[PDB]
Amino acid sequence: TDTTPPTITVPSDIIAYRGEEFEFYFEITDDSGQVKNIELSTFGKPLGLNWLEYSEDNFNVPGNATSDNPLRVRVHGTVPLNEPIPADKNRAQFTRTIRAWDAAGNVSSNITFVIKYRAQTDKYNPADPTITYVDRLSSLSPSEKNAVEAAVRAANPQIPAAARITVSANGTVTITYPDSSTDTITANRVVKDLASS
Amino acid sequence: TDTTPPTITVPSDIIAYRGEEFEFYFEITDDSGQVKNIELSTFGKPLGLNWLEYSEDNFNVPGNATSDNPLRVRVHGTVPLNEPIPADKNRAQFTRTIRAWDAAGNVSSNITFVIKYRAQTDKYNPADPTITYVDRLSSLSPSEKNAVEAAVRAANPQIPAAARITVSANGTVTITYPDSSTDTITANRVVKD
Ligand SMILES: CC(=O)N[C@@H]1[C@@H](O[C@@H]2O[C@H](CO)[C@H](O)[C@H](O[C@]3(C(=O)O)C[C@H](O)[C@@H](NC(C)=O)[C@H]([C@H](O)[C@H](O)CO)O3)[C@H]2O)[C@@H](O)[C@@H](CO)O[C@@H]1O
Ligand SMILES: [Ca+2]
Ligand SMILES: [Ca+2]
Ligand SMILES: [Ca+2]
Ligand SMILES: [Ca+2]
Ligand SMILES: [Ca+2]
Ligand SMILES: [Ca+2]
Ligand SMILES: [Ca+2]
Question: Which residues are recorded as binding Ca(2+) 3 (chain B) (predicted)?
Fold first, then answer.
């Protein structure tokens, strides 16, 4: 008889950014070559993460889980935009457990995986814009602020379109990402006096 | 022998907006059918409007100023972006005079014309944007503010590109024109839950 449960390989460094779709894979094998299903939990208790999803495609099919061709389970979702990040941002993670059944009733013992989530500015590092030349450094005109915003946007296509770029009276740039985290560009790297140049 | 000066028609409503080029026409007629030249002044004194210019095309040509085809003098210019606007609008204007003469040298009296000038928001009146649906009416997200600005811009190609559109936490829209005058679009014309 089959008395050996499936073996699960977990990803070692799962990093998610708030408001951005992410994915990772579990790889599962069984000596029988067949895995019936899995369970994601909090050490046997409810998962408690409704934004976490996975496909049951190819579950409980003969030969779906061999050493040569493991069952690859795609887990995906989006950490909510406003998921709380405490003062110590290392605390921004969820430790959860996974186990799997074979077709003979053997279930593996829960093993852990960790979903770390971070603010969007942790992912994005804005390049300085081409300098906008202005008439008064202490008081930008509406067209100068438009130009600055355009310049910052142009120098940073990798930044999400849903991020909002604002410009202060002295040309200080604020980039506010969809999750409301921010990056700043100081005025001296954004604007210069036109006449002096 | 011609002893009668030309007659001049001026526009009744010359309204210029700060920083934006305006144009208008004088129409001049003489009984001879010919007008030689004109003069713009401040009741005979220097005009004092260096940003105003007019064309001298077809001056002093026979037949350039008949009853049926008057001399049409194109005037244009741009009132300074930072021209101070008096609290009383009846003083937000330049009162000036034009005279003209024919080939015999008959000169008209000084005829008054008035260039009124106004802030850019007196011209612009923002159209309604497509409504943007938001999560919290009292606290818009960055993405929702982007959506709002984009909608206001898309609905208003006639507003200067140089105008800056800002969005507050509650979806109130401020449009700041190049001359720093403003319009406001109330939140309830902008966002919905
Ligand atoms: C509630 C309880 O006592 N559960 C224990 C459980 O303890 C968990 O053990 C994990 C390591 O195996 C972590 O130490 C868990 O702490 C964390 C995590 O999930 O990594 C710390 C994070 O900072 C925190 N995240 C936030 C945003 O605060 C999370 C969070 O509180 C929960 O994961 C959300 O539900 O927790 C720690 O809670 C473990 O020891 C098992 C062993 O059987 O026993 C109980 O279930
Ligand atoms: Ca087995
Ligand atoms: Ca950053
Ligand atoms: Ca005459
Ligand atoms: Ca003619
Ligand atoms: Ca207006
Ligand atoms: Ca008006
Ligand atoms: Ca903008």
Answer: 122
Residue A144 and residue A99 share a domain: no
Question: Nominal resolution in Å?
Answer: 1.7
Which of A25, A39, A40 shows the shortest CA–CA distance to A75? A25
Tell me the C-alpha distance between A119 and A178, whole Å.
10
Q: Determine whether the interchain pair A164/B177 forms a contact, defined as Cβ–Cβ distance below 8 Å.
A: no
Residues B134 and B110 in one domain: no
User: Residue A6, exposed/middle/buried by CB under 10 A (0-12, 13-18, 19+)?
Assistant: buried
* Chain A residues within 8 A of B161 when measuring between CB atoms: 146
**Nearest residue to A101 via CA among A181, A24, A2:** A2
Helix (H) or strand (E) holding B155, with range, is: helix B142-155
Residues B98 and B168 in one domain: no
Size of chain B, expressed as the number of residues it contains = 193
- Tell whether A87 and A5 lie within a shared domain: yes
Residue B54 and residue B98 share a domain: yes
Secondary structure tally for chain B: helices H, strands E? 1, 13
Per the structure, the count of domains in chain B is: 2
Ligand 5 centroid–CA B61 distance in Å is 9
Same domain, B21 and B103: yes
Q: Are A54 and A92 in contact (CB under 8 A)?
A: no
Note down the domain range covering A44: 1-125
Using CB atoms within 10 Å of the CB of residue B146, give its burial: 0 to 12 exposed, 13 to 18 middle, 19+ buried.
Answer: buried
Question: Ligand 4 centroid to B45 CA: how many Å?
Answer: 24
